[PDB]
Design a protein around this nucleic acid. Structure first.
Ligand code: MG
Ligand code: MG
Ligand code: MG
Ligand code: MG
Ligand code: MG
Ligand code: MG
Ligand code: MG
Ligand code: MG
Ligand code: MG
Ligand code: MG
Ligand code: MG
Ligand code: MG
Ligand code: MG
Ligand code: MG
Ligand code: MG
Ligand code: MG
Ligand code: MG
Ligand code: MG
Ligand code: MG
Ligand code: MG
Ligand code: MG
Ligand code: MG
Ligand code: MG
Ligand code: MG
Ligand code: MG
Ligand code: MG
Ligand code: MG
Ligand code: MG
Ligand code: MG
Ligand code: MG
Ligand code: MG
Ligand code: MG
Ligand code: MG
Ligand code: MG
Ligand code: MG
Ligand code: MG
Ligand code: MG
Lengths: 67, 185, 62, 144
RNA sequence: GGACUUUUACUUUGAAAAAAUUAGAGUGUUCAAAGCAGGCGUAUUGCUCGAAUAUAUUAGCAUGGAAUAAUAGAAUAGGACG
RNA sequence: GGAUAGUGGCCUACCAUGGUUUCAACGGGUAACGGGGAAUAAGGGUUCGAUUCCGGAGAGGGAGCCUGAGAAACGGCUACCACAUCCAAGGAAGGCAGCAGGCGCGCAAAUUACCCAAUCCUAAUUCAGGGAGGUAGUGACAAUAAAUAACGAUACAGGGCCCAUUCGGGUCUUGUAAUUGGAAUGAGUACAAUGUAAAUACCUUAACGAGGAACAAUUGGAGGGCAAGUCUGGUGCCAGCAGCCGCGGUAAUUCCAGCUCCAAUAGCGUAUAUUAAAGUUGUUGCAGUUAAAAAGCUCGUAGUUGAACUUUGGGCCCGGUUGGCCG
């Protein structure tokens, strides 16, 4: 078999310099659990609609139904 | 919008489809080299045509012509390193009269026949396409390998495969077990 | 010319040839094995002749 | 002499006199005038598809003698009416009225083939299945 | 010593030029289509060849040639040279 | 002069009557984006190029403009034209020739999947974003490699060169099997590792995986052109076949089939187009008395073409290249 190899001067300058997927291959980094590109994007877009905090806007909303 | 991964085709078919002459000659080459189909003859028949043209052209240049020399010797040089062009037909005039079998001769398959190993070009095939051969450390299962000069004396059975050490196959090993669990105990 | 001629016997002969099933037979070798067969068979053993040699002669002259 | 000019600067005439005469060349003219798109029942397209109007029994030209079994088709793409040969034995029992079929040409360059007059197209499919398959019982005509 | 064709055509040789494709050299992708890689060694901190070349027949530019074919010039001398 | 970033009839004012054309202007067609390029291989040519790169253009049709360095921008706005969605009937909103997907059209073209790991772009910016791109999916578009069996044993025929008087017979190697023998291998399937962003496949590899109803290859053809049946059964100018010639009316080598045989074979056939064959577009390179074709005749303009002659001969220098001979 033939591959490719690296040996970093100190563990530190690896963790810095290595791509973060090989990091997790070794355990040297956590497998971040995220929402799929679609869920992400779709959230980005739902947000696109709102101007400001919106923590304001839900006051606008909540006002209308409590009377 | 990538880059066109290029390709070309390796064969050509005959203009007259039913020359029983050519059809006869072809079949001889099929059984006297243990071939699969016509395309295996076609391929080389194409191959050969491109060589003779290349030659043909250079032969129309002047001798001592820069181009003729670099690429006339080059042609010959390749045709020698393979077993097609003999040690002193090393001219361009001889590469023209270069015949077909001249190539087909140097097949791994025909070569495996040409030194023990097989006793039959058909045995030779089913041996090659089954990891039962190695050029150097390299296992090679293509019947059309084209064996080179300095490569010739390195075609031996594999480091794996029963015919070369390391285990028997699994049909032998299947038998050693059926003479075992039954008659044994 | 005439264009509405009879259609009543469409399929005449096909529907009236007696069906007969194909006999079984040992499989014929496919691939390189076949051209082997064909080679050694057509010219190496050399069978029937006439001064021209014959592929498919029905029950000879005799 | 040779009846054509030779002059070093006669390119003009030669260039032109040939262009002027490519026209007696049929295939060229057909190609240039777009006949294929204009007259022709198909678009020019290798194949067309239409609906079967009636079964026709066309009688063969001499010296032969038979009923050649054809179909009248309403080509879907331009509603041109064109009659088509159903090949093989009793395959006319495979196509019906209002049936939608695929027609193709006869290999004869738009000329008619053999002893069948006015027919220049063959029926290759009917109701989306092949004809050959229907005939060799590899498939069934879908249950209209 | 530079500049120099009356005015052209023609022809030579170059320049400025894209890559991919084409032709074509190198290279054992296990063969091949391909790819443009790769190769050597103490393989415990290395060394090392490459990634060429041909092709464009229009026109333009530069240049060697002046055969062929056109073209200009002294005839009321309103000619040429100094 | 005005306008422009700026030249310019770009626009205006005034002034002239000019500009293009048989060396084809102008107008028409184009099932026309231009080129790099593709197919076809004696050559010369013929045909194609929506489409991986360059350039142009457009974003349902048109016009208009804002912002900005840059847009006459459309995942910007304004209007008309054409479509057309939501609605509490007052009103509001959309522009897939981006990616997927749907309808329609048709002979004709794939998943509403994963990801920024690579390639590279953007921004305030190593970080964010990117249906650019990459990955897998569908995928017999084309292309490459090339399994579907291999080797013995036995008994006959004998290729047996012989010995040799004869069913006598040396002895390998062809040919045949309702006769046997063990070896081999991956298609698969699958611990693992590898591969990957995560997967998947390939490469590698444990445990498995070959004896016929299997791991069973097909497509077309068998009169000529053209390779291969005058064998059998069916039909009887019917059904049907046949690019073309032709086959079929009772002994069909051409239909329907069985058997066998041929050809190409993981591919083979059909249709349309095109190229070679085509010296049947002919410059190379055709034809024209009678096969298709010399205008009834002559003049004549464009066009094509157009006698000969002007430094020829002699004499030298310089450094070059494949061959004489030889080591
Ligand atoms: Mg006739
Ligand atoms: Mg050391
Ligand atoms: Mg010059
Ligand atoms: Mg200006
Ligand atoms: Mg002015
Ligand atoms: Mg006027
Ligand atoms: Mg027109
Ligand atoms: Mg167009
Ligand atoms: Mg075009
Ligand atoms: Mg284009
Ligand atoms: Mg063009
Ligand atoms: Mg179009
Ligand atoms: Mg635009
Ligand atoms: Mg649209
Ligand atoms: Mg901006
Ligand atoms: Mg716009
Ligand atoms: Mg859009
Ligand atoms: Mg845009
Ligand atoms: Mg889309
Ligand atoms: Mg849908
Ligand atoms: Mg269809
Ligand atoms: Mg398709
Ligand atoms: Mg990225
Ligand atoms: Mg990023
Ligand atoms: Mg930070
Ligand atoms: Mg199989
Ligand atoms: Mg088996
Ligand atoms: Mg068959
Ligand atoms: Mg038959
Ligand atoms: Mg034939
Ligand atoms: Mg024959
Ligand atoms: Mg019969
Ligand atoms: Mg010439
Ligand atoms: Mg002629
Ligand atoms: Mg005449
Ligand atoms: Mg006249
Ligand atoms: Mg002259």
């Amino acid at each position: 078999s033939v591959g490719f190899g690296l040996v970093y001067n100190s563990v530190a300058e690896a963790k810095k310099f290595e791509p973060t997927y090989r990091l997790v291959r070794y355990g040297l980094a956590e497998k971040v659990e995220k929402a799929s590109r679609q869920q992400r994007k779709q959230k980005k877009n739902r947000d696109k609609k709102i101007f400001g905090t919106g923590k304001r806007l839900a006051k606008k909303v909540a006002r209308r139904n409590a009377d | 919008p990538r880059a066109p991964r290029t390709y070309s085709k390796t064969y050509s078919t005959p203009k007259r489809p039913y020359e029983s002459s050519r059809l006869d000659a072809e079949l001889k080459l099929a059984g006297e080299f243990g071939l699969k189909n016509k395309k295996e003859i076609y391929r080389i028949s194409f191959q050969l045509s491109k060589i003779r043209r290349a030659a043909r052209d250079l032969l129309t240049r002047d001798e001592k012509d820069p181009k003729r020399l670099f690429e006339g010797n080059a042609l010959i040089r390749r045709l020698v390193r393979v077993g097609v062009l003999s040690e002193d037909k090393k001219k361009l005039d001889y590469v023209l009269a270069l015949k077909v079998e001249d190539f087909l001769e140097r097949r791994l398959q025909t070569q495996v026949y040409k030194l023990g190993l097989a006793k039959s070009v058909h045995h030779a095939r089913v041996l090659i396409t089954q990891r039962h051969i190695a050029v150097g450390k390299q296992i090679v299962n293509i019947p059309s390998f084209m064996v080179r000069l300095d490569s010739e004396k390195h075609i031996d059975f594999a480091p794996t495969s029963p015919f070369g050490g390391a285990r028997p196959g699994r049909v032998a090993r299947r038998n050693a077990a059926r003479k075992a669990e039954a008659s044994g105990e | 010319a005439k264009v509405h001629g009879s259609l009543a016997r469409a399929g005449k002969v096909k529907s009236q040839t007696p069906k007969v099933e194909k006999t079984e037979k040992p499989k014929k070798p496919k691939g390189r094995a076949y051209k082997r067969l064909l080679y050694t068979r057509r010219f190496v053993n050399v069978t029937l002749v006439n001064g021209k040699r014959r592929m498919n002669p029905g029950p000879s002259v005799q | 002499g040779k009846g054509k000019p030779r002059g070093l600067n006669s390119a003009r005439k030669l260039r032109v006199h040939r262009r002027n005469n490519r026209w007696a060349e049929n295939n060229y003219k057909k190609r240039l005038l777009g006949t294929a798109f204009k007259s022709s029942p198909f678009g020019g397209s290798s194949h067309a598809k239409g609906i079967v109007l009636e079964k026709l029994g066309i009688e063969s030209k001499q010296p032969n003698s038979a009923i050649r079994k054809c179909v009248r088709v309403q080509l879907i793409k331009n509603g041109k009416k064109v009659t088509a040969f159903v090949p093989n034995d009793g395959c006319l029992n495979f196509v019906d009225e209002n049936d939608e079929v695929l027609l193709a040409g006869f290999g004869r360059k738009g000329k008619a083939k053999g002893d069948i007059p006015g027919v220049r197209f063959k029926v290759v499919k009917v109701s989306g299945v092949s004809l050959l398959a229907l005939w060799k019982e590899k498939k069934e005509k879908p249950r209209s």
